[PDB]
Amino acid sequence: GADADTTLTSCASWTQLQKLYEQYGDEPIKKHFETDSERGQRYSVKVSLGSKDENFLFLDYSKSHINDEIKCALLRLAEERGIRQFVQSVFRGERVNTTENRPVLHIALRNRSNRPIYVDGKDVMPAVNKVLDQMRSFSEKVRTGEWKGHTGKAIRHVVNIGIGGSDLGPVMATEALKPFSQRDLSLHFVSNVDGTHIAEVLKSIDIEATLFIVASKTFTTQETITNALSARRALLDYLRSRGIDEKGSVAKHFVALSTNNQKVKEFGIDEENMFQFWDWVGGRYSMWSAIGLPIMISIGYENFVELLTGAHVIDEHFANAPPEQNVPLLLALVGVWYINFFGAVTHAILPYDQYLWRLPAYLQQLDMESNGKYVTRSGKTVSTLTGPIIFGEAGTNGQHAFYQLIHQGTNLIPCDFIGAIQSQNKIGDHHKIFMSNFFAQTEALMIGKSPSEVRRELEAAGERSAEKINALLPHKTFIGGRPSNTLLIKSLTPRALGAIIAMYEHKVLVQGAIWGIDSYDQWGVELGKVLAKSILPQLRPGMRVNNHDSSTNGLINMFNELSH
Amino acid sequence: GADADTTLTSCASWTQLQKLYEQYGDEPIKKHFETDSERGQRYSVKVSLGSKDENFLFLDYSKSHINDEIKCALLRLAEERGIRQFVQSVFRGERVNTTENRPVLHIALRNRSNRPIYVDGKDVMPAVNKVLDQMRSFSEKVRTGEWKGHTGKAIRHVVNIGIGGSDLGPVMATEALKPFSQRDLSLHFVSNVDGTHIAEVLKSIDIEATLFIVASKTFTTQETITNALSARRALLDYLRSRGIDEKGSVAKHFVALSTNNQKVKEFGIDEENMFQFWDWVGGRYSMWSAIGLPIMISIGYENFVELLTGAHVIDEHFANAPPEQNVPLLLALVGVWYINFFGAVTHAILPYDQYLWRLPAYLQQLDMESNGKYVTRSGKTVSTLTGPIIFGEAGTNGQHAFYQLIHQGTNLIPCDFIGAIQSQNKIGDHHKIFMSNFFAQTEALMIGKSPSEVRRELEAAGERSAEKINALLPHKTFIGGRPSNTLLIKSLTPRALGAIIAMYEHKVLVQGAIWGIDSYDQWGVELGKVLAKSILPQLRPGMRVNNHDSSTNGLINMFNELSH
Ligand SMILES: O=C[C@H](O)[C@@H](O)[C@H](O)[C@H](O)COP(=O)(O)O
Ligand SMILES: O=C[C@H](O)[C@@H](O)[C@H](O)[C@H](O)COP(=O)(O)O
């Protein structure tokens, strides 16, 4: 391909970090706690959310292979790569998404201060606020029962039709903020083009009382349009079977969240029912825009404003807080330390909150689709590793699933443990039992259990058999020194969720800027789309192909032989 | 710790594989297709499931960096490490789980041939079949409406209470086999000790018509017992609020799936309502046993027998088929090639079937908890990498989520694409549109798009701007040579699911045997449990601690200050 990038590896700070890794990389995490009695406080930052309930976002990054020399060197890397100036460029509307020559302004969607942000010489704030007001008005009509279906019924089911950035945010947020929702409104999500997805939703709803929301930035995504057309056919099929006149039904049951005004009109949706968003709103950064309509319908306008405000508080913290006390910058640098120096290619998101069960899948798109790049903005091949593989499940289910590998496997896996001090559901002693695991797991990963400790524990329990002690000894040994970040909030309120997502959006921004890549494009999805479009007309019963490789030919031919 | 293991790295076959990697590792996958026109057929195996619908399990492992010399060398590794003899030892009941001195007989649970398998000189088959008959009788009473609640109502809600191996199988299988289910029976799963899990289920059920199933091998797991006690308190609280006599209510609403007869009696469950399983049934291999009761209640006895039969067909294939035509052995060897020689520490499970959306989470436990070990059976430290990190989501949602990283990231990620030729839900042209992506993605990962191909595509579309071509060129380039395995079935029937899970169970067996580890124990979960038990009595409002490291002390102290 192109020439190799030297801008990052030639930085004096990068050379120093490589030197510091060779020197201190083998030192166990516990050693840093033994030499610094105030490590927990010195390697942690509390950011107030500015609400009356005194909620906060506390990051503890102390359980890491980072001493003061490494922390200082990581901060110097941030200065050398011009992170401060890059952040200002993003926030002010500069076209940082260089491959598409477009601004990156998801921060404008939640700009509660209404500080003017310009695109093509025009302040975008009145347009942002106009859509938020349109969302308020419509969501209130749905929630109060004012918005009626074709047969006069109030809305009981809300079906979002969209994929990726037009699905994951709405799913994650409605699940995360379920205690703040209106329970009489059932939320359904159709995303997969697999006929099963729309089929199962159609079995679970009363189409007369259903509002379909077609969410798509482009309004041309094959999955979404195919599902939307089937949802429309279903509405018309129901009315026809009951003998009811179908004229004007689509306008009462369908709304659109898009940037493409022309494609929305071709479908048959009223322009009054189109909720606009812009090109500078990336799909994986769109839950704050019109895409957030199903979230607003579920939790209400005031709670949606709280979600936006939480993000805004972290946006202001990120842009203004000093480097050594900046939460998203520190989280990003700890990540760069593990990815580029330790060679850790995986990162676990472990939320100890059942409502946040869809957070790992959301962060998979946010991080992996943003930073899974191998070429820089200048078009040169990267000389370092970029985005890691994100995985995880809600705690404690993970403990009885894959923690065995995190504790005793052959891979170094940085983990983010997210938890809340207060539960929304106070059932007996469930929360303290739950949180005992939250604190214990990070402690366990850090300290481990040495061969000598295992021998003392077995001999203290009364085991006089030297054979059984020696045989079980290595299997019961925990090397420890496994890193983790602990993110603690007072409670998972809409403001708290907004804060958490914005923190991760900004972590991704910093990592992408350090590597010199474009965290805002997605050229990697194009080949699969083009080759699928070429294979589609070849999928007919009995048809034989020979234009692809022998594997693909054999697979398509077998499919055609047995499809029908 | 202990001495380093030399048994694997000293194998002549291992030394040869390292030599073959140095020689052929840089050769692109497409080169093997260009030199062998019959590669698709030669590097694929079709295993019949033995059913009247002519269903099968087809594995295509051709899209890999494997030529005939490497394939032969991988098969020689299997012979040298004694896989054939190890498999016979597992199937015949030998105590292969050396650290716990116990047999590994999940294959006995689905042994439809009723071939005698001995443990302590006694055939286990009559006991296996006795529980299957008990499950048949009870599941039929629940399904027909014969089993009544305390107030005389038929069962409408089935709530499984269990975690890990007592949760993931029941969740995955009931979701996977939803078209074969009895729709009037709503399945709920309480697993997390987070109060939210039981709370949300209690909001969704009619407790008078609810059967609670307490699933736990040991019947002492903190999460499960805490949830079970809250479910019991909920039943008694409801009856008390309505003024109804509670005597004999627990026996009508609670059943247990366990090995511990004593702990089940202490809870208050009738011995007639305890479904037994044994110590040789590992939790992550228990969906075929009594643990499968919620699956049988949902899909019925005949469909559960089909699930068992699918597993049995693959068990027989695995134990008897020649090495070069053995599906789980080949899948395991392709995995070893990528993990130990290419250094690929991640593996993606990408099922193109929405019903299989919980399959990746299931396989995470199966693979990661089994093979995430760093010590051998002999107690020596491994000299090779072991179990990889498993992740994934159902296709096509993954395409618009993280495929950007699989195609254009800095990591080599082996992928397993699983799909069905026939859908259970035939909605318009959804399935062909869906499957066009299935074939295209593996083709895309393999062939890529070279710098020259991108230039030809842009110049053919009419782009005369050399600047735009050169600028977009590297961003639109796909290096290709990304591996994948394609698993194709005729349709996802209960027999097909059984076949797929057994294949993965056996893949895990082979990989663990090659590495010389115990794939059947889980000592790695002990430290987190012990440290949580120590932290639990310290979680009281206002309490201050100083016995842990400064991070854990600071976290517990902050929690205690604001919990109440
Ligand atoms: O940044 C987001 C990604 O590019 C991707 O997840 C995108 O959101 C989907 O491809 C759906 O696109 P539409 O929203 O245009 O349907
Ligand atoms: O092999 C399985 C694992 O050890 C683990 O997932 C186990 O299933 C859970 O710890 C629940 O154990 P019980 O089934 O005993 O509650």
One domain, residues A214 and A329: no
CB atoms within 10 A of CB B252: 18
Look at residue B560 and give its three-state secondary structure: helix
Residue with tokens 């010590």: B375
CA distances (Å), B9 to each of A343, B4, B13, B18, B84, in order? Answer: 23, 10, 9, 10, 20
CA dihedral for B118, B119, B125, B126, sign (positive or negative): positive
B401 contacts A522 by C-beta, under 8 angstroms: no
A4 contacts A379 by C-beta, under 8 angstroms: no
One domain, residues A497 and A387: yes
Residue A385 backbone class (left: φ over 0; alpha: ψ -120 to 50; beta: rest): beta
Q: Is B27 in the active site?
A: no
Enclosing H/E stretch for B354: none
Instruction: Note the resolution in Å, 1 decimal.
Output: 1.6
> Which residues does A53 contact at the CB level (< 8 Å), separation at least 6?
A490, A491, A493
Query: Which pairs from B101-107 meet CB under 8 Å and 24+ separation?
Result: B102/B279, B102/B280, B102/B520, B103/B280, B104/B280, B104/B282, B104/B285, B104/B520, B105/B278, B105/B280, B105/B281, B106/B280, B106/B281, B106/B282, B106/B285, B106/B286, B106/B288, B106/B289, B106/B505, B107/B311, B107/B315
Give the residue from A278, A304, A327 where a domain finishes.
A278
Among A102, A160, A166, name the best residue to mutate to test ligand 1's pocket (greatest count of ligand atoms within 8 A of Cβ): A166
One domain, residues B232 and B263: yes
Look at residue B256 and give its three-state secondary structure: strand
- Ligand 1 centroid – CA A365 distance (Å): 10
A524: CATH:
1.10.1390.10
Q: How far apart are the first and last CA of chain B?
A: 44
Look at residue A396 and give its three-state secondary structure: coil
Enclosing H/E stretch for B67: none
Residue A93 backbone class (left: φ over 0; alpha: ψ -120 to 50; beta: rest): left
CA distances (Å), B74 to each of B10, B323, B440, B554, in order? Answer: 15, 10, 28, 51
Using a 10 angstrom Cβ sphere, with 0-12 exposed, 13-18 middle and 19 or more buried, the burial of residue A462 is: exposed
B178 contacts A200 by C-beta, under 8 angstroms: yes
- Ligand 1 centroid – CA B396 distance (Å): 12
CA distances (Å), B507 to each of B23, B104, B336, B367, in order? Answer: 27, 15, 10, 9
Phi, psi of B121 (to 5 degrees): 80, 5
Measure the CA angle with vertex A99, ends A98 and A100; round to 5°: 90
Paired with A417 in beta bridges are: A350, A486
B66 contacts B24 by C-beta, under 8 angstroms: no
User: Helix A83-91 to helix A301-320 angle, to the nearest 10 degrees?
Assistant: 150
Cβ contact A551–B39 (<8 Å): yes
One domain, residues A393 and A491: yes
How far apart (Å, rounded) are the C-alpha atoms in residues B469 and B474? 9
Using an 8 Å CB-CB cutoff, list chain B residues near A518: 475
Residue with tokens 């989520």: B401
B293 contacts B114 by C-beta, under 8 angstroms: no
What are the DSSP calls for A25-78, one per residue? TTS-HHHHHHH-TTHHHHTEEEEE---TT--EEEEEEEESS--HHHHHHHHHHH
- Residue of B237, B436, B553 to mutate for A, most A C-beta atoms under 10 A: B436
How far apart (Å, rounded) are the C-alpha atoms in residues B2 and B379? 7
How far apart (Å, rounded) are the C-alpha atoms in residues A134 and A142? 13
User: Helix A301-320 to helix A125-144 angle, to the nearest 10 degrees?
Assistant: 150
One domain, residues A16 and A27: yes
How far apart (Å, rounded) are the C-alpha atoms in residues A91 and B510? 53
Task: Tell me the two tokens of residue A224.
Answer: 């979404």
Domain with A525, as residue range(s), is: 517-564
Cβ contact A353–B490 (<8 Å): no
A179 contacts A425 by C-beta, under 8 angstroms: yes
B379 contacts A471 by C-beta, under 8 angstroms: yes
Nearest to B66 by CA among B43, B50, B88, B49: B43
Helix/strand/coil (H/E/C) assignment for every residue in B220-233: CCHHHHHHHHHHHH
CB atoms within 10 A of CB B204: 11
B184: CATH:
3.40.50.10490
Look at residue B548 and give its three-state secondary structure: coil
CA distances (Å), B422 to each of A503, B305, B353, in order? Answer: 43, 22, 10
Nearest to B165 by CA among B289, B282, B277: B282
B538 contacts B519 by C-beta, under 8 angstroms: no
B250 contacts B269 by C-beta, under 8 angstroms: yes
> Which residues does B370 contact at the CB level (< 8 Å), separation at least 6?
B284, B387, B508, B512, B519, B520
Nearest to A140 by CA among A308, A310, A303: A303
User: Helix B301-320 to helix B83-91 angle, to the nearest 10 degrees?
Assistant: 150
Q: Is A150 in the active site?
A: no
- Of the partner residues B30, B410, B434, the one whose CB lies closest to the CB of residue A386: B410
- Residue of A31, A196, A371 to mutate for B, most B C-beta atoms under 10 A: A196
Nearest to B227 by CA among A179, A357, A430: A430
B17 contacts B74 by C-beta, under 8 angstroms: yes
> Which residues does B134 contact at the CB level (< 8 Å), separation at least 6?
B275
One domain, residues A469 and A348: yes
Q: What is the CA radius of gyration of chain A?
A: 26
Instruction: Find out whether the peptide bond into B396 is cis, omega within 30 degrees of 0.
Output: yes
Phi, psi of B111 (to 5 degrees): -75, 85
One domain, residues A346 and A221: no
Give the residue from A480, A497, A516 where a domain finishes.
A516
How far apart (Å, rounded) are the C-alpha atoms in residues B266 and B274? 12
Give the residue from A278, A308, A331 where a domain finishes.
A278
One domain, residues B436 and B498: yes
One domain, residues A292 and A394: yes
Using an 8 Å CB-CB cutoff, list chain B residues near A449: 527
A533 to chain B, minimum CA–CA distance in Å? 7
Cβ contact A451–B531 (<8 Å): no
How far apart (Å, rounded) are the C-alpha atoms in residues B149 and B128? 28
Instruction: Exactly one of B52, B203, B247, B400 is catalytic; name it.
Output: B400
How far apart (Å, rounded) are the C-alpha atoms in residues B314 and B50? 10
One domain, residues A331 and A419: yes
A266 contacts A173 by C-beta, under 8 angstroms: no
Chain B residue with Cα closest to A528: B441
Task: Identify the nearest ligand to the CA of A100 by its number.
Answer: 1
Paired with B346 in beta bridges are: B389
Look at residue B178 and give its three-state secondary structure: helix
Q: What residue owns the CA closest to ligand 1's atom 8? A: A165
CA distances (Å), A507 to each of A41, A85, A87, B271, in order? Answer: 21, 16, 11, 55
What pairing do the DSSP bridges indicate for beta strands A274-276 and A254-258?
A: parallel
One domain, residues A7 and A78: yes
Using a 10 angstrom Cβ sphere, with 0-12 exposed, 13-18 middle and 19 or more buried, the burial of residue B326 is: buried
How far apart (Å, rounded) are the C-alpha atoms in residues A386 and B542? 44
Nearest to A389 by CA among B340, B461, B389, B50: B389
CA distances (Å), A447 to each of A450, B12, B67, B538, in order? Answer: 9, 39, 45, 19
Among B160, B163, B216, B362, name the best residue to mutate to test ligand 2's pocket (greatest count of ligand atoms within 8 A of Cβ): B163
Task: Tell me the two tokens of residue B326.
Answer: 């053995």
Task: Tell me the two tokens of residue A325.
Answer: 């006390």
Q: Gap positions in chain A, given as the residue before each gap (C–N > 2.5 A)?
A: none
Phi, psi of B148 (to 5 degrees): -105, 150
B288 contacts B505 by C-beta, under 8 angstroms: no
Q: Is A317 in the active site?
A: no
Task: Tell me the two tokens of residue B495.
Answer: 């027999």
What pairing do the DSSP bridges indicate for beta strands B56-63 and B484-491?
A: antiparallel
- Ligand 1 centroid – CA A283 distance (Å): 5
Residue A316 backbone class (left: φ over 0; alpha: ψ -120 to 50; beta: rest): alpha
Using a 10 angstrom Cβ sphere, with 0-12 exposed, 13-18 middle and 19 or more buried, the burial of residue B500 is: buried
B39 contacts B33 by C-beta, under 8 angstroms: yes
Instruction: Exactly one of A175, A208, A369, A505 is catalytic; name it.
Output: A369
Residue with tokens 């290709």: B480
| Helix ranges restricted to H, A147-273 | 168-176, 195-204, 222-241, 250-253, 261-267
CA distances (Å), A218 to each of A215, A267, A278, A410, in order? Answer: 9, 13, 10, 43
Chain A residue with Cα closest to B398: A164
Our answer on whether the CB atom of A166 is closer than 6 Å to any ligand 1 atom is yes
How far apart (Å, rounded) are the C-alpha atoms in residues B174 and B292? 10
How far apart (Å, rounded) are the C-alpha atoms in residues B27 and B23? 8
One domain, residues A179 and A213: yes
Nearest to B515 by CA among B379, B367, B387: B387
- Ligand 1 centroid – CA B392 distance (Å): 18
Using an 8 Å CB-CB cutoff, list chain B residues near A178: 200
Enclosing H/E stretch for B60: strand B56-63
A528 to chain B, minimum CA–CA distance in Å? 5
By what technique were these coordinates determined?
X-ray
Domains identified in chain A, total number: 3
Question: What is the side-by-side order of every strand in the sheet holding A274-276?
Answer: A186-190, A157-161, A210-215, A254-258, A274-276
